[PDB]
Scaffold this active site. Structure first.
Site, PDB file in Angstrom:
ATOM      1  N   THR C  45       0.839  -1.206   0.000  1.00  0.00           N
ATOM      2  CA  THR C  45       0.000   0.000   0.000  1.00  0.00           C
ATOM      3  C   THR C  45       0.875   1.258   0.000  1.00  0.00           C
ATOM      4  OG1 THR C  45      -1.737  -1.191   1.216  1.00  0.00           O
ATOM      5  CG2 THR C  45      -1.968   1.123   1.167  1.00  0.00           C
ATOM      6  N   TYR C 133       4.424 -12.869   4.850  1.00  0.00           N
ATOM      7  CA  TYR C 133       3.307 -12.242   4.171  1.00  0.00           C
ATOM      8  C   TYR C 133       2.941 -13.061   2.920  1.00  0.00           C
ATOM      9  CZ  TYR C 133       0.980  -8.470   1.485  1.00  0.00           C
ATOM     10  OH  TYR C 133       0.125  -7.726   0.737  1.00  0.00           O
ATOM     11  N   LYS C 161       1.094 -12.371   8.028  1.00  0.00           N
ATOM     12  CA  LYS C 161       0.033 -11.587   7.420  1.00  0.00           C
ATOM     13  C   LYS C 161      -0.551 -12.478   6.323  1.00  0.00           C
ATOM     14  CE  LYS C 161      -0.862  -7.431   4.621  1.00  0.00           C
ATOM     15  NZ  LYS C 161      -0.315  -6.249   3.869  1.00  0.00           N
ATOM     16  N   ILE C 203      -3.400  -6.202   9.251  1.00  0.00           N
ATOM     17  CA  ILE C 203      -2.588  -5.175   8.593  1.00  0.00           C
ATOM     18  C   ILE C 203      -3.473  -4.664   7.487  1.00  0.00           C
ATOM     19  CG2 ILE C 203      -0.463  -4.716   7.279  1.00  0.00           C
ATOM     20  CD1 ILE C 203       0.882  -6.877   9.092  1.00  0.00           C
TER      21      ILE C 203
END
Ligand SMILES: [K+]
Ligand SMILES: [K+]
Ligand SMILES: [K+]
Ligand SMILES: [K+]
EC number: 4.3.3.7
Lengths: 292, 292, 292, 292
Positions: C45, C133, C161, C203
């Site tokens: 992001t 992740y 994540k 997250i």
């Protein structure tokens, strides 16, 4: 009724492919003894595809007789033509069954509007409680939460068997329906998760051969004891998975025979006998569950 | 005949959902005049799901009667129970049909061995040519090239309608079967590509409303004139896609009514009437095709 | 630290595409005020793809400076080459960040063994806590629970994540790892479900513009007040969805600018400015959340 | 040259993971002698992910040096940040390469408009021919035919490596672009089908070890002799599939070592050594191809 562990019961057959009453009696006694909450008679696991409607009705009626009021019986009533779904449902009006399990039309792939009209028409021709059944990998269509919400407004449409294995559906549906609308898992491997998210029980294949464990797991879940329930789930997880190593109900019928619950593992074409590799796979899962 | 453009014909209905003889006559005359190779009667596009076997047989017999020997008729005979497939096939023995179109069992998800035993048994109990039909998005199972290769060794299993839209299947199957085994597309939007790769024809929905163009396109393809065929295909491509904008046969029945080929666009539940948006999309596709 | 609502913070830019310190300060102050638990700096992001490693490091260091010990900062450190992942991680050794967020290698599609060796090597070159992740739709690979279990045995690999949106992963991983291994959602729309199943936080992209609501939702979840939390989730659900109407972080940057949290909504190619249709979609989701 | 058999060449390494000039020389001599049309240097199969831009440039320059004008060289130049793609491209201006192979940005998942702006900008700042590269399973995005059609209007965007394995893309793209735009398969197992549908060649992994057969197959295809080409393709099909039994280029590097074409089969993390099972599968495929 419509919570806890509900068995999607096999239709035990003799070597000729017809219902075996002795085996069915043994199974029903087993479920009564095990604390199974209800029986789904002639659903998918019960070979609804390969029984004609008369044979289907005979099995449901026999199951109801044998249950003898000790355990509730839900009839599988799905059909991909609305007129046929109505006709089948009507066979069981005033029978003693407590409700119907009715699948989204398969093969003809109706729209969400078509699903709505299909189930609404069915519900309008019966006083029986209706449980919707969504299983897109088998049917070619997917009854979405918005449409479930629409149908939940119909008086006798009272729950759903959600067999996608997509756990996001639980709360998507829950927020669209009233608090007494029942949410049941149709996916054994994700059923405890489903209950942990707010589901009320499971219509289970595993329950055919691990009825007591399943009943106990669902009780713990209902009471909020998820860690305790998970110990049982872990014991059963190889079965949750391997009962689909070959097309259902090939594995679970073999497992029933191996446990001495039914006389033969016979099925109707296009189901075929379990492979040697399949037997050993399922035997190992039974061993892991502590059942052999 | 099992090459060229074969129409998966609609079953035209009056407002009560009953077969309309006058409309059916008109469609058949249209296909005779327009060069269609054959008619598939009561396949998917013919609403096989919502006709009972008596209505099914009646429509096939009516189609044979009206065709009056001017165009070959192939009966849809698929069923998800092998005994039912066999029984349905017996109804058409010495009827005058030239063959049967038989789908992989839907909903019960048989193994490859199950599919093999299913089709083998059907083929055993008839002299009629059998065309296999694979459409995994609708059925929940996928008849793979290896199994097609096994089945092609059965004398009267003569071809396949391959509706995956996965064009790699053409040569995967072709290499495992004899040069006389017929490969037919069941996916209009990819059918010309399918023919360019080695396919022999198409069992088509689009052919219901663009029979002449489809017939010419398929002949050009068979002759190796792919660029010429593709010009036609480009005009038809919106139709190839938009005839599935809502569930088949909702769009194609509306299109037939719009062209004056059938009296009403009525279907049976769980099919429902075309939406306004659907009408607009389909009409634009018909105009792109030069049909309106 | 590594529970509750963690923001996957945007890297606000001026019109030239370079980091805007005033906007970043405003954002960090906002997160401190809102009760956000931690900041992930230069994750996906934050446009990790389009910043070079020096620019990336500058943003992390600036974020740490601006945080001024008031809120923990996790650095995005993912790379698809193991040597580059090590090098990037080493830039932050003794920096003040509390840990790293490191993605499965993208594009080169390593095996489960390759993932294991990749993350193990990274962990061996740092004393920083590592959060794995997994986001297969972006990377082309899927870090399975069994491999997560293997990696959780490495001392400084401390959480994951999980951005698949597949809620079955929660308990599949949980049963393979120790009780202090952290499970964080990387999928805003399913994050509350994820926490209800045993997850420890999220997250979040949504947290960029609804930081207080997200913090409060995660607190309620941690305390077991899921019904209360769900009211907030329902308010935010249009944002959870529509912040991906165009590729992240196009929508969330526009939303930040609209709320006056950043000076410009500038991004780097191949991200492009939000469409008019996108603006209106996101504006409606902001309105629904009660933020405009 | 941008037709026929183009090899996506391995970057051969010594035991320390550094480029092996002697091995590279041998491979290039092999491709010159075997009729390969061109070499793609430092594409995916060349481990573009794990070489830094200096090593990348060095390998391309070494490849040009060793080729010594005997075979055209195309540089892999793809990057997920537009500025990096542009910078990398500038390194090869007046190098002697004939063109660039440039992949859709991976991991950041740009929109179609983003892809358009990405490739437009790259093409703007060079005179070198650009070949677009679509491989959604690896990148997380899909460059659709419409956008390819837009990009093909840019003077120096001259073709596409289409690696979906979705054969419908061939004519969807062909109809939107000029007759001089090159359509190349990036999926070895479907590449002959791709050529039969209108494709001009293949950027091939299999060509690393079956260069002569691939070259003959592609020439036969270009001449319309598909049955003859298909005999070759059938011998190569196990290789086409099994060179991806473990992540590319693990299998093909092992195969090259086994044939004596390279000194070692060493890769860089996160690639890891071939498993024993992989060795067996690949060796059997090589024998099926007649290579061992
Ligand atoms: K109700
Ligand atoms: K045959
Ligand atoms: K650890
Ligand atoms: K051009």
């Amino acid at each position: 009724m419509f919570t806890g562990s509900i068995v999607a019961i096999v239709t035990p057959m003799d070597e000729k492919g017809n219902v075996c009453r002795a085996s069915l009696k043994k199974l029903i006694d087993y479920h009564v003894a095990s604390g199974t909450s209800a029986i789904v008679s002639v659903g998918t696991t019960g070979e609804s595809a390969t029984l004609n409607h008369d044979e289907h009705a005979d099995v449901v009626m026999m199951t109801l007789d044998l249950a003898d009021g000790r355990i509730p019986v839900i009839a599988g009533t799905g059909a991909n033509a609305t007129a046929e779904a109505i006709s089948l449902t009507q066979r069981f009006n005033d029978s003693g069954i407590v409700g119907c399990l009715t699948v989204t039309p398969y093969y003809n792939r109706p729209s969400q509007e078509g699903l709505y009209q299909h189930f609404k028409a069915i519900a309008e021709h019966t006083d029986l409680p209706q449980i919707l059944y969504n299983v897109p990998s088998a049917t070619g269509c997917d009854l979405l939460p918005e449409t479930v919400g629409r149908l939940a407004k119909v008086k006798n449409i009272i729950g759903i068997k959600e067999a996608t294995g997509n756990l996001t559906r639980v709360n998507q549906i829950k927020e669209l329906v009233s608090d007494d609308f029942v949410l049941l898992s149709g996916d054994d491997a994700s059923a405890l998760d489903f209950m942990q998210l707010g589901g009320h029980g499971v219509i289970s294949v595993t329950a055919n051969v691990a009825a007591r464990d399943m009943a106990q797991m669902c009780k713990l879940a209902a009471e909020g004891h998820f860690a305790e329930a998970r110990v049982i789930n872990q014991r059963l997880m190889p079965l949750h998975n391997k009962l689909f190593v070959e097309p259902n109900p090939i594995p679970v019928k073999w497992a029933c025979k191996e446990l001495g619950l039914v006389a033969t593992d016979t099925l109707r074409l296009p189901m075929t006998p379990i492979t040697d590799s399949g037997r050993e796979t399922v035997r190992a899962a039974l061993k892991h569950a502590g059942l052999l």
